[model samples]
Target chain A: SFHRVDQKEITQLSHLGQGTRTNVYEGRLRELRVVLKVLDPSHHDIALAFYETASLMSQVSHTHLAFVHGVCVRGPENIMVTEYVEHGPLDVWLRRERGHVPMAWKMVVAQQLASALSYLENKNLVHGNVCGRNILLARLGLAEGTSPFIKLSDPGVGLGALSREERVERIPWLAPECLPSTAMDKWGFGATLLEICFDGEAPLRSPSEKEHFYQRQHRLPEPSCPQLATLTSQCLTYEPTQRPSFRTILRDLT
Target chain B: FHRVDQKEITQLSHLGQGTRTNVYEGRLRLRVVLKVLDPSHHDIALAFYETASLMSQVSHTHLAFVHGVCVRGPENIMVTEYVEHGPLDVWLRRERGHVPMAWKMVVAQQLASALSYLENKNLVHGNVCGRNILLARLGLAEGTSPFIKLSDPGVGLGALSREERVERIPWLAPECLPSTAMDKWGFGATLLEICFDGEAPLQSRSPSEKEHFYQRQHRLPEPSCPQLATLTSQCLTYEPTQRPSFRTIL
Candidate 1:
């Protein structure tokens, strides 16, 4: 488990984005730039819940997932201290850079995502949520070959009381028979693959389209690239049992 | 031909900012958006004259009315009528949650009307976006009382370098970017913003995040209405031939 960072220890700089239950801020954590996710006064009930979530996040290390630095669980502000991703959410970022990002970078991005979900399951951990924006973009001072890196935010990052549209937006995350087995992870990753192919918005834009899937098993349209459509095949399978396992999914990533 | 003595004009408030041209709300017996050239830039008089000459040729109800140029000043100044309500994007936010879908279409249609004129004239609006377009509460008979006027359509780009222009192009196809195709994409993006409630195509927080977004396929189809998206698709389609003519858009 991560150490307890005094709620008063963080120096708030600017407002990042927020979930329904909590607001996140960009702040300095002892000297490093960090993101602090804290509950408002009305949200004190879930403070302890995040303490466990932060602890779970600290258990496994993956290059694609954001690291938990510490937690502030005992006060008006239950802070979840996480490593700062300068670029923020992939959803918002993708719109800004549109067209300029080459197909090569996107292929690596897809690879890193499969690698993360695959790593999580190995530690007996399940990512409660997997989407483009939940994944944070990071540019480390490293070899250009491995320049564009991402950190998947903490576990259950998306569970915070999603609104009507939010619920509808996440409809693409699962197939009709979503069981959340190791197979379900592949399904979420597949949805993200199409999200990248479309460029920030997910391919499925309506509940009617989602309802179409549940009622008739009609899948979303294939990506323009031939290889992309082929790669998404096994993961987007309507038959839950037919979806590739994490080990096999990871193998295909390379 | 708005011939005004440089001394008679009184600067009131800042309206817009350009590379070498600064726009202001100035009085020349009327409230007007003034385009004053900066002497700090290279070949001040020549650039100003070219801008004034180009603007003078444009005479459409949807386009900003160019009153005339200041021929006698140490620096050149072009005057156009002031738009009270300001930019369409800013006005949309100011009256948040109140703008109707029909009203959004009204603005889009009028902008298209002006673009068609530019196309026929063989003129290109170097830059086109919600911020560059103006909306006014004009006293009119039609339900479209709040009329939109296309402003600063590449006027400030006279001294703008070709290298920089190519550097800043986003989410677009091959060369001839400053052509009608460029305006088409910008119009499509602006329409998307209106449909999406003022979210810019490139909504990055900083210059750093632009690269942040580009690296991640992780991009921007944020729209709710299907018909609007369909029209936007025609304008923003990667294939130029697929884009509809302004006549078709109208």
Candidate 2:
């Protein structure tokens, strides 16, 4: 029942980030602090894209999945207000040299994201975009150190709602089907795991460091974690059907 | 730049409170007092926006500096400079005989002067009482002269419900027209309380009884201090026209 957001209730927002199709801000919806992702007006026929994304988002809900507080989609104010998850990018925690941020447990990240993806699979949906940038470390609990909620966010549709690199990078782990599929999502997830074991080397890709990147398939380092090592290797298998479902991977994690 | 992030704000202690807001001694950069509104109350956004907007528009020596506001939604908080001495009524009550009579006059004059400043701006403070008046210490010691600032002009009347607002029957002026003159009458009641050591000017509870007591009673009897007694009596005069302008009172 609580799916509509009044545009007037959103306030005190500052720019968080923006993509080709959207501009995100840290705003509030009444009492709830939220992130407002609005459709960029410069693009033609922008209204429908947000509605589909919002409609699709509202159907799925999970602890590890991003929480959408609904959208403000009146004429000029096409916006999506979602929960503001703290902590840096998912890949930042995956790095071995975690700098100063409390080191994120690899298994914890794995379980949470797996649960998020498994939940998404149950909803007849695919994360579509499952990479380090689309995920965040949602830190909570006592001592500010604990297994963080690995929040999967912004699984926006391809060709629209994304940067060219975000759209193009899908080629790295493309399955035999050569399209958006859940198995492809798992393949990207495995690349992220492959990234986790790489000891957080070079965080993510910079414009220049697209050379030293958070990419897939070309091959990276680390495998000694054994059971999980075999899991990532299984996910990277060329045949999409051969990859284990997130549900299976989750059981394996337990 | 005026918009504040609640994430950065740390609540140091719970201090002042109100009908719709709870005041907190909080910190952002320096110590600040936060008046956080109940987000669930009907049209709280209107009251919050109106109050924050009005508070941000003013600057006065007798006015506390508005730090910033976390405007609109689940938690609406207004931040102002923290005053060490706390509210005037409590301070006057706590210090009792230790406070100099002249400093009480300073509090009265500063209170009236602030009303006069708001008067010149065409702003009417519908609620004026000792509690809403905050005292900042002029000296580092306890019995120091306290510089005063009037708090909540618009929110004084705006934030409160008509029923809850009328609860301060003792301080509210009789009928109290929607004019700056209304402040003059409340100012009278406030000054009267100061003379009487922050006690209620009338022992009666209801408005009708308060008015009856005002007409029949000796109006808290004449104070030993003639100037304070005379000024308060004139301000308390039933006819709004008969009350002295805040400027004249100052």
Candidate 3:
């Protein structure tokens, strides 16, 4: 069901996210706070990027995706209206509160994020840029009728880019196979899982500088922690064809 | 000895030479005709080929010296001074035209330039043609005026721009025929003899052509009819060491 919000009668706010090309601002439309992404026509990639992002966001209604309100093509700029969250990008949240979060919070975040990713995979879509910045800590007020939820956010910028290598999945919060070009979204989900399980730090070998030096010289990251490391090992297997889907991860977790 | 000509300087003429740049017609202080080469000719191979060509052109006095080389953008040019006279083919027609002694002596001088350069640099003159000669007057005498001097010296003495694949060797070494080390001088000398003898050096004339080169396979041309057959035959001795030098000829 399409929610009605006058695209033209929106007011732009001063606070904004620092995107590479597009201008993202915290704005409001019809009394609802929104993050309005205005596409910069100057950048070819950004214009195409925003369109693809908006198109992809319009497809799914999972708690993981940022809700799209309406588009405002204000003659000069293409504006995207999205659901605004009080907490900023995942990177800022991780820095501020990831360390002290209990293992349960990590598991909950991982489980929900993986669930969203599984939904994405069913659409045959890849969250090519799954990182600490994409997840939103949506603290659901626990009332009699309301359960706390960890919602996914910003699927647009990450969806269109198809990774040709395994680096995309290898981000600290994601699997190694997600390094840059590898678009194995499930592996990225596992990496994100590992980060959630172990408080945002990617599994490292020895914390000592000397061991770190040797491993880094050979492009080898540190050995993961025993519990989270085993799961990461399976997800980040260099072979993309070998990685199991998010459905498998959910079944395994259950 | 630095032979200097103070009177009228004799410069090389380029009335009908086909090349990229015009060969500047002039003379050196020594009366040798200045044959300015296109600057890019040296750089055609890309690497610091200028230094290599100059190094080669300067080492032998018998060969033309690279007076100076300049590079303008992608263009490469050089200067080589030589004695003014028609090349062998021209001088040959002016003389007995096809005399055995004149032709063999011409071959002797060509071989001298080739052997001396190859011996010193441990290189090879991969391409030897009749056009690379100058019939210069070593002295003012009439007999010397007819002397055919070899010029335009350096040949296949450096790294090649392209692969040293099997190519047309109308007159190539036996190794060349077999796609072996035949880029050797042995068969090259034979080709030169055949060229002056008014016959095509190699039987194969086209790019896709080939012919027998072994001693038993084809009848070798008679050495006596050309008179200097002994010297001409020495070039076909199979062994490179047997080939005569400029010192031997002198």
Candidate 4:
């Protein structure tokens, strides 16, 4: 249930990013600055897909999920209006404020993301993309013990919307099953956790056939924190069935 | 008294002054509407929580976005997304020619949608007037639809003086002069104002005791547009129960 935003109501302020199938722009919606994610019109089926994705995103109303105000369809451009997350992507923020990342803030981010993921699962939805790039920080002023606003963005469109290239790009975060399921999300959550712990560093490079076979049999290397290591170990287990649910992850992290 | 840190907030022009709060154009990072609630009275705390609770529950394109709330020393400051171009009343007054019917419908529809959403959750806007309606991209260009949002939805919970209450009497339902149902009546008055090119409903008489007495006996004047007249009449019905619900208004 999103509003139909007119193109004239939104004045583009600046160019944010140019992605493969989408171009992000910073725009002013009246007085409030917002982020507009415009889907490439040349994609042909993008209009219907954008509406479907917008409808799903509208259902969620948690503090940790990016708030989608509405969607705009102006000729060839289809834009989704979202709150401008000032701190940018979590991975970018992590890189900028390295050692200063306190243990408490790290715990808050993990707990919040886990809580969001748990909510999504309850609604019978899966966040296909849960890496650092899809996570956004609402406020940038980070401190040792204060709780920072962390939200998970781009709860990917349904599996049918994902292409082979997109799926391949997310291989490092996917489980051995290679399906977009809750079990697969647990594996991604583990990778995101490691990203949080190691300041946005990738858990591993593109795996070879031998590495894939080995990963399917054993757990990834644990982080320095005993609690995080335990949670990460349980999540990145060889068997997808053995991977913990977001509820379990939230309970452990909190 | 709440803690006040002068350094954190740089107050600009004062946007509004209410019974319990004073709104100012302030900066957190960019520009934000800073509402500082006075702590001089014990009831202000109650009003603050009521406002916070209602705002936290609802988030829509037609509602103001609350950023965060902090106790800035002597007052409780609630920061919100600053909507430029002020209120709908300003634009309604500034328009030179006859307002378009399509534009009127757009404003009416957005207000109804927002009210319907609140009513479904068993929450009422409580305050619905031209002043509470914020417009975006105002005066930008012709041929553009107005982007309107309802603000200060639950901030009217505090006690108001008789004069203050009378200011809204013309828009209030006859049965409950200042209750939630009055919001529907206010919506009707607001719609009529837009259609009539910014004329206040029942402008001939002052909102004194005599006006309330007259209102109890008679209804407000109908607008020129027949469709709008019917909708406006349905909302301003003497029987509060008979007044058209926001669901139907949409």
Candidate 5:
């Protein structure tokens, strides 16, 4: 079992992100920069959560996918050690490196994202959440006979794992039916596409929470960008059975 | 680890189907089914033979992906496995269970995941190959949730799995550098628009010499269906990368 690194052993690198349930910190280990997304006591069952996480992560081997290096569990503090993703969240990183990112860059990220999700789908798994936020656009060098690397983080995280009511309370990124069912994972994906094209805007941010939900249910006023709009329409549909699976999405992207 | 049941599982009910393959029910610990009679197979190393091993023990929660094989050893034999809820062919299902909007979206999601696996495996379902590709329903419910499964492991194992090429070289996607790449669009008619709902795209012509392809390229007759026409036209574009990818196909 991997043990948690002490604060002394962890030289603080920077703040990566923070969520209601956890605080993410960038830290250095030996000579490498790594990230520590530490969970809160409110997060629940850290070891079990990560055991499943680790199991899933172990199966994913790709430069475009994140790998877990260690886990640090202590009372009220649960930390997951992952390779430090150099670029920030996809949208933000893209903006920062906009001048440098080639049209091929989006293709690279899109293709890599599609490649990684294919592995997850092969296992009959659904990544509970996927979006620009979940994607860390790490700078990958372009070389022949070699491919650029993208690091997909936070696989199988959130919503679907929760109960109907709990998902309602926590998963703002998802479409409606997902609350009571696993079918929501795909709806969440549609939201992910919206985030991608719109630079991380939630698919439908309702004027009022209730009205927002109304639009989701009715499939009203689809997003404006044609590329993402088309994808979001297919992804956010209400019926789990009716939606196109990720394979089709990748097919469409081709 | 799970064990395979040797009994041939028959189709429980004819769920929806496509042109190239027929689906049936299979016996296992569950309501697993099988897709048989794919017109593409000719050898033991064909797609079905390879899919059996790849899916035998694989498992993931969101993937409706299933695997079973009839032949295991050096000799090629038929294969069997659990059926996914439906294939993109669900688009062709007459009485689609879910709401139309929700259904289209979910199909895109599931398809992305399933094919992502093939992409990771460095393969493409060369045929996307237009027959009866079944989208699988794989959620907790008896009938509600569904994910797209690439059924009919017959046409394009050649383009799947990075380790080696498996199917006949002819049906390969042209865009992929080699004629072996599953990336070409010609197979789309059979796999995407036409197989499940309409007529098959390319009528099987007499086996022709390789040199004939250059003369015949882009001159094939247009598919009768417009959506399919656009899809197939784009797929068959002389430029491979320009041909929409599976990611773009959704």
Candidate 6:
């Protein structure tokens, strides 16, 4: 029920990034800057992924999540159009100079992720794959020039539908159960928080050869903040029933 | 790729059906036409690929916009933006000879322009008949072009086999039996139909004789409108090479 754009409306600018199933490109839509996520036409299995992501985004609206403008489903040029989030993915911002980000912004990132997850949970939906790589940061305002915010991108391409290579690649963010569920998502949220707290370092070997092997462990490495550490511990509980609810996590984050 | 909301798509009426496709009037937030092709039909399965490839490659105001294509149930579905006033043949019948002469010329010019563009791209429309030409109100009060669009251009899935092609034999130029040149002849036939108030070509000849006589003698009835008669005769020339190219026609 959002704006429906035709293929003629968008002009591709440059390549941004590539995910397991889709390629991201910088593009202009109706004269406004946008990021277009185009699914590989050859990947027949993920043919419905763009439509699925659009449907889920339409159902829930939050400032902490990427704002989907519309989609063009004409032929094999399937595109998912969204507002361009500034400053790149959260992981990029975290790896800069050690003290480049103030503690307040890190708290803001945690609160925003929790807020977005809370919104999804209320809708009986889960951000099946949540990680620092999937979170984007935007500079809030130019007045003071330092207020940054976070938005969760790339949700609802269900984890179960991902190829085996994709599932293995994102193993560090998964729970010991190794399946996507609301419980596993809560665990993923904790992994994201750990990355923020540790200045972009992974709690469990993030980009490592044994990433999938180590993901089956009982616990993740402790974070710098004791308060975040405790939250991570609660979220990383081996028992799916013991993971904190998004509502509870939102409460504790603030 | 996403499951279409059945509630959003309200079937207003059945538009028509071909050998492999069924068309329906649908109201989604706005009016649209849904063309459902049976994947079980081998010809239709191949036709969908051809249509999809061509739709992706071309973009022009004179051509209809394909809103989307998806696989649903046992059929492959295509959704297109709805054009008001429908096909040109319908209006030709209602107004008969009373249709403004200016409107007929506008229709002919617009179609010639579309064919020229396709020719430049090394593509052939394969079907150029009145039924495949759609019209919309282009904010003109009355007696103007009204914006015509060409639909279902490539391969002409509406009729595939020679038996089915026989139905359009009167529109088929002599040398165009197994060639894309039929499009040029069909366009000339459509022009005659419009000028004659929807009268089909060669009315006196039976279907069998129509195919045989047109193939043998290579003759077409003179159109009622003299200016159009000149243009149609050039398009309906005996030799396909003798016909004026769409570029020259434009």
lDDT (10s digit) by residue, model 3, range A51-126: 6767667767896667777677776677778877645565565554554555455556667777887788777876
Give one digit per residue, the lDDT tens place, for model 1 in B165-241: 44333333223433576677767878888886676666644544544444453235746767687788777665667
In model 2, residue pairs whose N, Cα or C atoms come closer than 3 Å (at least 3 residues apart or on different chains), thus clashing, are A30-B73, A30-B74, A31-B74, A95-A200, A96-A199, A96-A200
Per-residue lDDT over A65-96 for candidate 1, one digit per residue giving the tens place of the 0 to 100 score:
88888887545667788888756788776775
For model 5, the stretches where C-alpha displacement exceeds 4 angstroms are A1-9, A43-47, A94-107, A140-149, A156-172, A181-184, A205-216, A220-225, B1-250
Provide the lowest-lDDT 10-residue window in model 5 chain B: B162-171
Model 3 complex DockQ against the native? 0.00
Give per-residue CA lDDT, model 4, range B1-250, as digits (tens).
2233556667799888755678899886456788888865656666665676677668887888776676766777777768866678766776634356777788889889988888777776666878778875442222235677788653454454456556665565565444456678888988887777777666666767535564566777888767698888888777777777777888
lDDT of 6 by residue, B1-250 (tens): 2334455566678887744678788866457887777666656566665775676578776787676565666777666667766777876786564466776788888888888888777776666777778886421221113578888653353447666566666665555454546567878988888788777777666768777876577577898788887888888777777777888889
State TM-scores per candidate.
Answer: 0.50, 0.45, 0.41, 0.48, 0.43, 0.47
Kindly report the docking quality category of candidate 3: incorrect
lDDT of each: 0.68, 0.66, 0.50, 0.72, 0.52, 0.72
Note the residue pairs that clash in candidate 1.
A93-B213, A199-B219, A200-B219
lDDT of 5: 0.52
DockQ of 4: 0.02
What DockQ does predicted model 5 obtain?
0.01
Q: What is the lDDT of candidate 1?
A: 0.68
B30-103 in candidate 3: lDDT tens per residue?
A: 33343333444444434334333644444553454445444444544344554455454454443332244544
True contacts kept of each: 0.00, 0.00, 0.00, 0.00, 0.00, 0.00
The C-alpha local distance difference test score for the whole of candidate 4 amounts to: 0.72
Clashes of each: 3, 6, 34, 6, 94, 0
Tell how far residue A176 is off in model 5, in angstroms: 2.4
TM-score of predicted chain A against the true chain A, for each candidate: 0.84, 0.77, 0.74, 0.86, 0.76, 0.88
Which predicted model would earn the best TM-score?
1
Distance from true location, Cα of B170 in model 4, Å: 50
